[PDB]
Paper text:
An alternative way to improve HDR editing rates is through downregulation or inhibition of key factors involved in competing NHEJ and MMEJ pathways, such as 53BP1 and DNAPKcs (NHEJ) or DNA polymerase theta (MMEJ). Using targeted saturation mutagenesis at the i53:53BP1 binding interface and a screening process in primary human HSPCs (a cell type with intact DNA repair, DNA damage sensing responses and other cell stress sensing signaling pathways), we identified i53 variants that introduce stabilizing interactions with 53BP1 and are more potent than i53 at increasing HDR editing outcomes in HSPCs.
We first screened individual and combinatorial saturation mutagenesis libraries targeting two adjacent i53 residues L67 and H68, located at the binding interface of i53 and 53BP1, and identified amino acid variants that were enriched in the GFP+ population relative to i53, in particular variants that introduce a positive charge at residue 67. Of the 19 new variants tested, one (L67R) was found to be significantly enriched relative to parent i53 (L67), although L67H was borderline significant and was also moved on to subsequent validation. We observed that the L67R change enables a new 2.8 Å H-bond with D1550 of 53BP1, and that L67H forms a network of inter- and intramolecular H-bonds, including a water mediated H-bond to S1554 of 53BP1 and an H-bond to D64 on i53. Next, we quantified the potency improvement by testing a range of concentrations for editing HSPC cells and found the variants induce a ~ 3-fold improvement in potency compared to parental i53 protein. Comparing the use of AZD7648 with the i53 variant L67R across different loci, we found that DNAPKi and L67R have locus-dependent effects on HDR outcomes, suggesting that DNAPKcs- and 53BP1- mediated NHEJ pathways are utilized differently depending on the target genomic sequence. Indeed, we found that combining both inhibitors resulted in an improvement of HDR larger than that of L67R or AZD7648 alone.
Residue numbers in the entry:
A (entry chain B): -3 to 74
B (entry chain A): 1485 to 1603
């Protein structure tokens, strides 16, 4: 909630969406947020950051992706 | 008359503005927009900035090589093979970005509305 961070997600259609995520959110939770906003079922979603796959069970922080509030990662669906 | 023009446009109340082109003036104060990344949707006229290219010293958000968006300032542009590149400075350093890598936050785009808003 209060300490959430902005991320971007590029979908297969070329649309980029934003999400607010907790440093602690799991990848599954990120996929649920993408479903909730954009309608893509989690079973279709495979997320990557900078060419590396994001595993179910990890947070973005488990990948050292979230920085300060100045820099916002772009995740990509593949 | 706006058909065919390059613009930067958002599709949500608090969203970011993305580069694209108007392909049609449609009903109810909306315009069909083809975004440069291939997304097409109808957008409200109030959410369109008719600025092409984004002017010097505009504060923008740009996608760096490391796959982070962050703020920068436009310092130049280059047209090569029909494509536009922006020179944007971040933390004192300039790099070149494709047009489609340069977006505007709500605040950044609101700064441009008085001069470049449609309508």
């Amino acid at each position: 909630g209060p300490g959430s961070m902005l991320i971007f997600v590029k979908t297969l259609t070329g649309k980029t969406i934003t999400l607010e995520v907790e440093p602690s959110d799991t990848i599954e939770n990120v996929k649920a947020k993408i479903q909730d906003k954009e309608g893509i079922p989690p079973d279709q979603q495979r997320l990557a950051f900078a060419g590396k796959s994001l595993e179910d069970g990890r947070t973005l922080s488990d990948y050292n992706i979230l920085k300060d509030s100045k820099r916002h990662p772009l995740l990509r669906l593949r | 008359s706006f058909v065919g023009l390059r613009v930067v446009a958002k599709w949500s109340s608090n969203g970011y503005f993305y580069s694209g082109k108007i392909t049609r003036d449609v009903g109810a104060g909306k315009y069909k927009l083809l975004f440069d990344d291939g997304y097409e949707c109808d957008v409200l006229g109030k959410d369109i900035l008719l600025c092409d290219p984004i002017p010097l010293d505009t504060e923008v958000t740009a996608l760096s090589e490391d796959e982070y968006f962050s703020a920068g300032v436009v310092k130049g542009h280059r047209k090569e093979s029909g494509e536009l590149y922006y020179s944007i400075e971040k933390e004192g350093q300039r790099k070149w970005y494709k047009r489609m890598a340069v977006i505007l936050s709500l605040e950044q785009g609101n700064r441009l509305r008085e001069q470049y808003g449609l309508g």
